[PDB]
From Swiss-Prot, chain B:
This is 26S proteasome regulatory subunit 7 homolog. Residues 13-45 are annotated as: Disordered. The N-terminus is blocked. Interacts with UBR1 and CIC1. Present with 105 molecules/cell in log phase SD medium. The chain holds residues 96 to 148 of 467 of the full protein. The gene is RPT1. It is found in: Cytoplasm; Nucleus. It comes from Saccharomyces cerevisiae (strain ATCC 204508 / S288c).
UniProtKB/Swiss-Prot annotation, chain C:
The chain holds residues 1 to 102 of 338 of the full protein. Belongs to the peptidase M67A family. It comes from the Eukaryota. Present with 19800 molecules/cell in log phase SD medium. GO terms for molecular function: metallopeptidase activity. GO terms for biological process: proteasome-mediated ubiquitin-dependent protein catabolic process; ubiquitin-dependent protein catabolic process. The modification N-acetylserine is found at S2. Residues 8-102 form the MPN domain. Acts as a regulatory subunit of the 26S proteasome which is involved in the ATP-dependent degradation of ubiquitinated proteins. It comes from Saccharomyces cerevisiae (strain ATCC 204508 / S288c) (Baker's yeast). This is 26S proteasome regulatory subunit RPN8. GO terms for cellular component: proteasome complex; proteasome regulatory particle, lid subcomplex; proteasome storage granule. Keywords: Acetylation, Phosphoprotein, Proteasome. N-acetylated by NAT1. The gene is RPN8.
From Swiss-Prot, chain D:
Its main location: cytoplasm. This is 26S proteasome regulatory subunit 6A. N-acetylated by NAT1. It is found in: Cytoplasm; Nucleus. It comes from the Eukaryota. Belongs to the AAA ATPase family. The modification Phosphotyrosine is found at Y167. It comes from Saccharomyces cerevisiae (strain ATCC 204508 / S288c) (Baker's yeast). ATP binds at G209, P210, P211, G212, T213, G214, K215, T216. GO terms for biological process: positive regulation of RNA polymerase II transcription preinitiation complex assembly; proteasome regulatory particle assembly; proteasome-mediated ubiquitin-dependent protein catabolic process; ubiquitin-dependent protein catabolic process.
UniProtKB/Swiss-Prot annotation, chain E:
This is 26S proteasome subunit RPT4. The chain holds residues 49 to 242 of 437 of the full protein. N-acetylated by NAT1. ATP binds at G174, P175, P176, G177, T178, G179, K180, T181. Belongs to the AAA ATPase family. It comes from the Eukaryota. The 26S proteasome is involved in the ATP-dependent degradation of ubiquitinated proteins. The regulatory (or ATPase) complex confers ATP dependency and substrate specificity to the 26S complex. It comes from Saccharomyces cerevisiae (strain ATCC 204508 / S288c).
Length: 193, 53, 102, 264, 194
């Protein structure tokens, strides 16, 4: 191997949580989307600094809705202001479903794995959250070849992990297939607070 | 379990332009759904469709 | 132009970004972050939807010497309109830490 | 009508024909380069319409839901970029409220109504109110048009050739055969001669008399002779205990007779 | 002649027969790239249509709030639904017909008022033409029919003079074959209302 492999604890800063929700709530009932800026340190610690949205050229969550020029142009802008950092995932919204990726959105996540090795797909529920707290879960997709020959348990150990059963059975099948899910935590500055 | 239903009309699924890729009113061949505008020469639909109620 | 604006209500997100932007550009006193302010106006209720950073350099030897990235602004204005059309240029923030005559 | 041969030397100076001949060395380069473009483009454009046909064949699989078309909206897909509908109104940006074009509201046989923007495979020059359409069950899209069909009981009434009696087994009663063929058989065959006379053909004949005189015989004969669609009907079959489904039987049987025309 | 330019013109005339060959192919391929792009408009629309969904039609039964509306759907059950934010809140009120996503049950967009498909079939019927010179014997009855049917359409100012209501509701009755169906068929092509 190259690493022992375990799924990321996402320390989503205040500005990024709040921003994904603004954009995705406005976008009800369409699929909404955009890219995540952050930095990857440790064996599982992804800090997501900001998000920025990807202008809809499709229906949302398509590869017709991800434009090469747009991607290029946004990056080129972020350098002037120092916000340029590497892409640590992408967000999207289902406002008709819980946190559970649909078949089309797996296909979008399969393309992101080529781009980035540790890219997450984060499902933001804008209205459908079932607790007082916002329900968001992050997923990563790794191949079926590791998971089937029984390397999935090893990957999920030495961490507290997260189990959800929001769509019950449907979730479990999906969860299994993709990879895993891990506790999501929030980074607060005392200026921000 | 097999639900009991009923035939209302036998529809022909080959040679009737069931595929409308060259039909627009009556511009369809109605002799092929096997090489009408197909990448294959062989069958792409069935011999018989039927209308169940 | 209109002077009919009796209140400004600002979203938590606008405040949080502009403030957040100050340390993302890693500026310290006597260097300025400014950004574009997007939102609704022409009304009494101003509703401040979003903001994005600009680069801003302040020289205070002469208050007639200033840096502003012109092209950046026009480009960015057009992209934001395709997510949501209610975003217009309604102003710019100055990062303080006080008012000036400048 | 030919040029550049020994005949043009007689007609015209030899100086003109040098400039005509040096030109055709240059002119053929236009034909040669531009032919490469079309033959190479015509292999790529021929690939485009087959590459989509391959996906058309994944959708076309059975079974699929049945619908009829409540109303074709027929909004204008392009007519401005200030709208995107048939309607034109002041102000640009009406967001995704303007996004209705050639559109079908279909009502399914689950007895619900959906709107969708149709598949242009099925043209809206087909669709009228009340046409049978297929609709894919998974996502309601008009998959195809189904030919309009009618109740299975009606379908049973159509002829399968009723035994020929000719007019050697309608023995006697000549005058009745004569009176009957004038009202039923001539307006089919000789339909042209009444149009000329400016009179209208009958709408029917009635046969009445005492039982056993072969009124039923003469019809059975008539079936064999005209070789058109003969819709057999028995009047107590038509009456039906479900409210006005007896009436549905009238209209369908006669609707059927429009199609299979000429009819008896 | 006895020229060598008599020979040159034979040699370039082999290019002029070759201009004719080129023309057959060039024009034939030009028109065929124009045919494969007509087909290309129907076979791309399947793909784009396949990226569309059906939307359960309902109607705003009655406003609760600005975020939450009550929509009763055309399948039975009443729902309490959300909004798209393009949908104008002053255009959403009781009677109006709306469409709803099958995934989210969200008010997608407004539609014009809708009617049963049986009643569209009733207005289709009316073909050909009959005038009141194809009716005879009934010139008295033609006038009392027009007294009720033509006049308040043209001018209800006549009925207003007297201070009396306009009539509506005509019953025609007769022994069969008196032309009672005929009388109405003729007046349907004349009056020029629906
Ligand atoms: N003129 C005739 N020539 C030949 N056969 C006849 C003649 N009249 C009647 N028949 C025979 O008598 C049989 C029985 O009569 P059929 O039932 O056809 O009579 P109908 O008067 O139409 O009766 P109903 O009104 O009672 O149904 C016929 O099927 C036929 O074989
Ligand atoms: N008043 C009339 N003047 C001229 N032609 C007439 C008149 N009445 C009937 N006819 C002719 O006879 C035809 C048949 O009559 P039609 O079927 O319209 O009658 P009806 O009295 O409406 O019938 P039903 O009782 O079956 O409802 C007409 O189409 C027309 O050619
Ligand atoms: Mg009548």
């Amino acid at each position: 191997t190259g690493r022992d492999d375990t799924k990321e604890t996402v320390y989503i800063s205040s500005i990024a949580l709040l921003k994904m929700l603004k954009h995705g709530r406005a976008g009800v009932p369409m699929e909404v989307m955009g890219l995540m800026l952050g930095e990857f340190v440790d064996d599982y610690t992804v800090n997501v600094v900001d998000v920025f949205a990807m202008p809809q050229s499709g229906t949302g969550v398509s590869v017709e809705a991800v434009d090469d020029v747009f991607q290029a142009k946004m990056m080129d802008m972020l350098k002037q202001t120092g916000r340029d950092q590497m892409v640590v995932g992408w967000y999207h919204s289902h406002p008709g479903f819980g946190c559970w990726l649909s078949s089309v959105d797996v296909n979008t996540q399969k393309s992101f794995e080529q781009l980035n090795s540790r890219a997450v797909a984060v499902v933001v529920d804008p209205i459908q959250s079932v607790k007082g707290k916002v329900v968001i879960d992050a997923f990563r997709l790794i191949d079926t070849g590791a998971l089937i020959n029984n390397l999935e348990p090893r990957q999920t150990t030495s961490n507290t992990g997260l189990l959800n059963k929001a769509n019950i059975q449907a979730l479990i099948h999906g969860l299994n297939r993709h990879y895993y899910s891990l506790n999501i935590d929030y980074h607060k500055t005392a200026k921000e607070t | 379990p097999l639900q009991v239903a009923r035939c209302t009309k036998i529809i022909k699924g080959n040679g009737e332009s069931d595929e409308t890729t060259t039909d627009n009113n009556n511009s369809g061949n109605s002799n092929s759904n096997s090489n009408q505008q197909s990448t294959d020469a062989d069958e792409d639909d069935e011999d018989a469709k039927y209308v169940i109620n | 132009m209109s002077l009919q604006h009796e209140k400004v209500t600002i979203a938590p997100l606008v405040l949080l970004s502009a403030l957040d932007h100050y340390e993302r550009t890693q500026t310290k006193e006597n260097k300025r972050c400014v950004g574009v302010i997007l939102g609704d106006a022409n009304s009494s209720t101003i509703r401040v939807t979003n903001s994005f950073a600009l680069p801003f350099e302040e020289d205070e030897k002469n208050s007639d010497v200033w840096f502003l990235d012109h092209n950046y602004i026009e480009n960015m204005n057009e992209m934001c309109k395709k997510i949501n059309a209610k975003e217009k240029l309604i102003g710019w923030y100055h990062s303080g830490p006080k008012l000036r005559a400048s | 009508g030919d040029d550049e041969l020994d005949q043009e030397i007689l007609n015209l100076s030899t100086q003109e024909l040098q400039t005509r001949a040096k030109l055709l060395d240059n002119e053929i380069r236009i034909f040669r380069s531009e032919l490469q473009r079309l033959s190479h483009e015509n292999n790529v454009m021929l690939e485009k319409i087959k590459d989509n046909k391959e996906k058309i064949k994944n959708n076309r699989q059975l079974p699929y839901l049945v619908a009829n078309v409540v109303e074709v909206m027929d909004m204008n897909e392009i007519e401005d970029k200030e709208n995107s509908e048939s309607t034109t109104q002041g102000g640009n940006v009406n967001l995704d409220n303007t996004a209705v074009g050639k559109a079908a509201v279909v009502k399914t046989s689950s007895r619900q109504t959906v709107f969708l923007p149709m598949v242009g495979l099925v043209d809206p020059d087909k669709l009228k109110p009340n046409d049978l359409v297929g609709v894919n069950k998974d996502s309601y899209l008009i998959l195809d048009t189904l030919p309009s069909e009618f109740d299975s009981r009606v379908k049973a009434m159509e002829v399968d050739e009723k035994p020929t009696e000719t007019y050697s087994d309608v023995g006697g009663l000549d005058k009745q055969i004569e009176e009957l063929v004038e009202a039923i058989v001539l307006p089919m065959k000789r339909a042209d001669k009444f149009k000329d006379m400016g009179i209208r053909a009958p709408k029917g004949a009635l046969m009445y008399g005492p039982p056993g005189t072969g009124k039923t015989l003469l019809a059975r004969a008539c079936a064999a002779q005209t070789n058109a669609t003969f819709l057999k009907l028995a009047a107590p079959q038509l009456v039906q205990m479900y409210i006005g489904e007896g009436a549905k039987l009238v209209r369908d049987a006669f609707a059927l007779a429009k199609e299979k025309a000429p009819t008896i | 002649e006895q020229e060598a330019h008599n020979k040159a013109l034979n040699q370039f005339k082999r290019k002029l027969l070759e201009h004719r060959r080129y023309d057959d192919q060039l024009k034939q391929r030009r028109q065929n790239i124009r045919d494969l792009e007509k087909l290309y408009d129907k076979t791309e629309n399947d793909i784009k249509a396949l990226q569309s969904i059906g939307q359960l039609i309902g109607e705003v039964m009655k406003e609760l709030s600005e975020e939450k509306y009550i929509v009763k759907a055309s399948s039975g059950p009443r729902y309490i639904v959300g909004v798209r934010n393009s949908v104008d809140r002053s255009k959403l009120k009781k009677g109006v017909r709306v469409t709803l996503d099958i995934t989210t049950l969200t008010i997608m967009r407004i539609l014009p008022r809708e009617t049963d498909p049986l009643v569209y079939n009733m207005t289709s019927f009316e073909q050909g033409e009959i005038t009141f010179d194809g009716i005879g014997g009934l010139t008295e009855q033609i006038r009392e029919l027009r007294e009720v049917i033509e006049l308040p359409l043209k001018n209800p100012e006549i009925f207003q003079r007297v201070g009396i209501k306009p009539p509506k509701g005509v019953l025609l009755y007769g022994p069969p074959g008196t032309g009672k169906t005929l009388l109405a068929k003729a007046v349907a092509a004349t009056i020029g209302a629906n």
